[PDB]
């Protein structure tokens, strides 16, 4: 009696912008599903983000690094917005070492097979002295939402004072979601429509996987109502 | 009677929370009622919230 929706087009216009078409949907289900999926996407899409940083020769973020154009606070802020895709692990430790004149970008982190840098042109900082050598350890975890550094605390609440440069984690890989319900020229019915979800993300998530995860979350939540006791 | 003076500087982050006074440049001061989740926020036709 109802025509179930199905993925009919996943257009990847760019690495961070994708159009996904669902067809067909009956009248009213288009807006319902669009709003439900948009909210689940914006709310509960997991991802990976920079959590802890430990630069050598640095005690706290309220200090200056030698021969570096930007403050350590600015460096941590730039590392907050680093788009990293991690496969197979929920806790990875990257190492970035650099020296000499030049912009230290995202392409200079020591390469590992389980980690991918979506945007190698992301400028982390700059070096302005030939002898200036920078070396940092970046801990990346897989999480969901936004966990500010002030709330999360160490397991035993006692960690290296010199390190523990805690960066606020914005785990959400998606930044903008629109959805449109448009008339489809179906030769069988005339009340059918199509749901175009236009997604703009950080490039770290596969749009089809994200939509399937959102649908799984929605179904698991509705299972409590369906299985009622 | 003063032998040694040790001055210690403490730096603390202060993040916006319900209650902080925020204003424009026109006297339109107000108080943060709550932090509304991004999906609950109104969005325009392009999906860009406010």
A197, closest residue in chain B (CA to CA): B47
Q: Which of A28, A25, A9, A37 is nearest to A179 (CA)?
A: A37
Residue A194 tokens, joined: 């199509």
Q: Compute φ and ψ for A147, nearest 5 degrees.
A: -110, 100
Separation of CA A47 from chain center = 5
Cβ of B45 within 8 Å of Cβ of A178? The answer is yes
Q: Write out chain A residues lying below 8 Å of B47, CB-based.
A: 38, 176-179, 198, 200
Q: Which of A102, A106, A103 is nearest to A79 (CA)?
A: A106
Q: How distant, in Å, are the alpha carbons of A10, A36, A87, A115, B24 from that of A19?
A: 6, 17, 24, 26, 38
DSSP A141: E
Taking domain A47-170, whether its CATH number is 2.40.40.20 is answered by: no
Q: Which of A22, A38, A18 is nearest to A206 (CA)?
A: A18
Q: For an interface test with B, which of A178, A182, A196, A217 has the most B Cβ atoms less than 10 Å from its Cβ?
A: A178
DSSP A107: G
Terminal alpha carbon distance of chain A: 28
Q: Write out chain A residues lying below 8 Å of B11, CB-based.
A: 60, 62
CB-based contact (8 Å) between B18 and chain A?
A: no
In this structure, is the dihedral angle defined by the CA atoms of residues A25, B47, A217 and A7, taken in order, positive or negative?
positive
Q: How distant, in Å, are the alpha carbons of A210, A212, B30, B41 from that of A220?
A: 15, 12, 41, 25
Nearest Cβ partner for B39 among A39, A62, A198: A39
Q: What method did the depositors use to determine the structure?
A: cryo-EM
Q: Where are the beta strands (DSSP E) in chain A?
A: 6-14, 17-25, 46-55, 84-86, 91-99, 102-105, 115-117, 123-127, 133-144, 146-147, 165-166, 169-170, 174-183, 193-201
Residue A124 tokens, joined: 């982390």
A98 and A68 Cβ atoms separated by less than 8 Å? no
d(CA A189, CA A186): 6
Separation of CA A159 from chain center = 27
Cβ of A62 within 8 Å of Cβ of B15? The answer is no
Q: For an interface test with A, which of B14, B39, B49 has the most A Cβ atoms less than 10 Å from its Cβ?
A: B39
């Amino acid at each position: 009696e109802f025509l179930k929706p199905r993925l009919v087009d996943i257009e990847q216009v760019s690495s961070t912008h994708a159009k996904v078409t669902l067809e067909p949907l009956e009248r009213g289900f288009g807006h319902t599903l669009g709003n439900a999926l948009r909210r689940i996407l914006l709310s509960s899409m997991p991802g990976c983000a920079v959590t802890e940083v430990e630069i050598d020769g640095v005690l706290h973020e309220y200090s200056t690094k030698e021969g570096v154009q930007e403050d350590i606070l600015e460096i941590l802020l730039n590392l907050k917005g680093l788009a990293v895709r991690v496969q197979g692990k929920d806790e990875v430790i990257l190492t970035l070492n650099k020296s000499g004149i030049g912009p230290v970008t995202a392409a200079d982190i020591t390469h590992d097979g389980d980690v991918e840098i979506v945007k190698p042109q992301h400028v982390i900082c700059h070096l302005t002295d030939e002898n200036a050598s920078i070396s940092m350890r970046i801990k990346v975890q897989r999480g969901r939402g936004y966990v500010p550094a002030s709330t999360r605390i160490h397991s035993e609440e006692d960690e290296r004072p010199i390190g523990r440069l805690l960066v606020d984690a914005c785990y959400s890989p998606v930044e903008r979601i629109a959805y449109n319900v448009e008339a489809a020229r179906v030769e069988q019915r005339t009340d059918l429509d199509k749901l175009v979800i236009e997604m703009e993300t950080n490039g770290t998530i596969d749009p089809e996987e994200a939509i399937r995860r959102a649908a799984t979350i929605l179904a698991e939540q509705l299972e409590a109502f369906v299985d009622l006791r | 009677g003063v032998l040694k003076i040790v001055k210690v500087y403490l730096a603390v982050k202060r993040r916006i929370q319900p209650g902080d006074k925020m204003a424009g440049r026109h006297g339109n001061k107000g108080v943060i009622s709550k932090i509304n989740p991004i999906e609950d926020m109104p969005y325009d036709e392009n999906g860009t919230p406010v």
